């Protein structure tokens, strides 16, 4: 769902064409800023097949 007005992430804000990463457990999307993941970090995980979980799913 690419809805530009839908609220996402810990911060409850739209995607705003910002870098976002999808949690491999809840499948929701998170701004890299809010979970501490830069584009370089997230692309590297995706390229290497390394799964990532948001902070809530980790706990």
């Amino acid at each position: 769902d690419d809805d530009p007005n839908k609220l996402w992430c810990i911060c409850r804000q739209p995607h705003n064409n910002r870098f976002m990463i999808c949690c491999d457990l809840c499948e929701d999307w998170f701004h890299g800023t809010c979970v501490g993941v830069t584009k370089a970090m997230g692309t590297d995980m995706e390229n290497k097949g390394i799964d990532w979980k948001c902070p809530k799913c980790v706990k």
Binding site: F19, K39, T43
Partner: peptide, 7 residues
């Protein structure tokens, strides 16, 4: 983990 807006 899928990603978007990575340019």
């Amino acid at each position: 983990a899928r990603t978007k807006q990575t340019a």
